[PDB]
């Protein structure tokens, strides 16, 4: 898998990324990372579409298999950043797909990059309502230089859901190990700011300028309130469309990964058909 590990200049910053110069036809996959973590999250999901399509990771300041203090910044940033490399890879058409709230990069980077460039966007296992007070905490938490890895070790828990789950272990306990608290107190501070100054995601989506095809596919929260919001969004909205997967933990692109990839495909092939 680390052959396709690259690393380029991008403004100041040196970011690495995944790329495996597949030549083929278009789109693009473009496989957005969340918060303090790597491509390592897409590497079950990189084997499922690898053969078939070109596929890009690309990661974030202060983001990779050795994790460096940076100076600050947010989601606009990652935007700008995702950009850059789509240019000097010379990359036009392709569909961004985003786990948690790297769904902010993707619905900004939607609006940036507009409908010909960017026609449709998967958005995985992201929490689409404004923050409920369990999850408030934890990026109270989290900003906090005394408890922030208490605040990540309250989030493993949510997201592992009482599962021992051996593969999404070991990203967080192993993969996510390296990331201090440069990381993850920004990604509490840009997180709660993104939910403030655009409401949610939801909100988000539905100011865009140009609404297009969006998909959001997740395995939690597994309530029954949560699917309801997600239907009732997709009722109101004829381009929001969403499947609960059922899997175990909070990383569909890990645990499973041949279904993420089914949506994919099929996203891909719409785009495939004009
Ligand atoms: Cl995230
Ligand atoms: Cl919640
Ligand atoms: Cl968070
Ligand atoms: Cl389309
Ligand atoms: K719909
Ligand atoms: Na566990």
């Known amino acids: 898998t680390d052959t396709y590990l690259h690393e380029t200049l991008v403004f100041d910053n040196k970011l690495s990324y995944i790329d495996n110069?597949?030549?083929?036809?278009?789109?693009?996959?473009?496989?957005?990372?969340?918060?303090?973590?790597?491509?390592?999250?897409?590497?079950?999901?990189?084997?499922?579409?690898?053969?078939?399509?070109?596929?890009?990771?690309?990661?974030?300041?202060?983001?990779?298999?050795?994790?460096?203090?940076?100076?600050?910044?947010?989601?606009?940033?990652?935007?700008?950043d995702a950009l850059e490399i789509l240019d000097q890879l010379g990359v036009e058409?392709?569909?961004?797909?985003?786990?948690?709230?790297?769904?902010?990069?993707?619905?900004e980077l939607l609006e940036q990059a507009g409908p010909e460039r960017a026609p449709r966007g998967i958005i995985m296992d992201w929490l689409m309502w404004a923050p409920k007070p369990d999850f408030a905490k934890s990026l109270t938490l989290l900003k906090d230089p005394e408890r922030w890895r208490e605040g990540t070790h309250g989030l493993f828990d949510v997201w592992?859901?009482?599962?021992?789950?051996?593969?999404?272990?070991?990203?967080?306990?192993?993969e996510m190990a390296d990331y201090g608290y440069d990381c993850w107190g920004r990604s509490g501070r840009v997180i709660e700011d993104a939910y403030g100054?655009?409401?949610?995601?939801?909100?988000?989506?539905?100011?865009?300028?140009?609404?297009?095809?969006?998909?959001?596919?997740?395995?939690?929260?597994?309530?029954?309130?949560?699917?309801?919001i997600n239907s009732d969004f997709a009722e109101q909205h004829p381009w929001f469309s969403y499947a609960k997967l059922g899997g175990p933990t909070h990383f569909p692109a890990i645990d499973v990964p041949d279904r993420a990839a089914v949506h994919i495909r099929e996203f891909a092939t719409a785009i495939r058909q004009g």
Not at 49 to 77: M, T
Not at 93 to 107: A, Q, R, Y
Request: charged content about 25%; overall charge negative.
């Open 21 to 80: 110069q597949r030549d083929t036809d278009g789109p693009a996959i473009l496989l957005l990372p969340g918060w303090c973590h790597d491509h390592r999250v897409y590497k079950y999901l990189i084997q499922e579409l690898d053969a078939d399509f070109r596929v890009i990771v690309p990661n974030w300041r202060g983001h990779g298999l050795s994790p460096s203090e940076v100076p600050d910044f947010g989601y606009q940033e990652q935007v700008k």
């Open 93 to 107: 058409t392709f569909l961004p797909v985003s786990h948690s709230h790297g769904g902010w990069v993707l619905v």
């Open 160 to 174: 592992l859901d009482g599962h021992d789950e051996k593969r999404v272990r070991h990203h967080l306990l192993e």
């Open 197 to 228: 100054r655009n409401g949610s995601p939801m909100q988000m989506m539905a100011n865009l300028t140009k609404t297009r095809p969006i998909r959001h596919i997740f395995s939690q929260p597994t309530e029954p309130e949560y699917e309801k």
